[PDB]
RNA sequence: AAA
């Protein structure tokens, strides 16, 4: 599974990069005031459930990353996460 | 719905 954690990463660190999070107002309508996602919310998105449904691999390809931070169930962007969130 |  170690070339699909990579493909997974990579992905999942798309969706919170600056340049998708300028345009993704669906993702930050989603965010709590802290900035954090549910991890499952990201895994029912379209390219991460094309690759997986195993949550145990979502999880493992975000501990990989430099780019999010996990908090039990939860996802966000590492840096500067509170300037993100929208209304819903 | 590179939600």
Do not use: C
Request: charged fraction near 35%; avoid cysteine; aromatic fraction near 12%.
């Amino acid at each position: 599974q170690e070339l699909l954690k990579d493909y997974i990463k990579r992905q999942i660190e798309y969706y919170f990069s600056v340049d998708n999070l300028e345009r993704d107002f669906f993702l930050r309508r989603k965010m709590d005031a802290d900035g954090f996602l549910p991890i499952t919310l990201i895994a029912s998105f379209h390219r991460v459930q094309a690759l997986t449904t195993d949550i145990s691999l979502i999880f493992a390809a975000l501990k990989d990353s430099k780019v999010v931070e996990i908090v039990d169930e939860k996802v966000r962007r590492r840096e500067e996460p509170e300037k993100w969130p929208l209304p819903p």
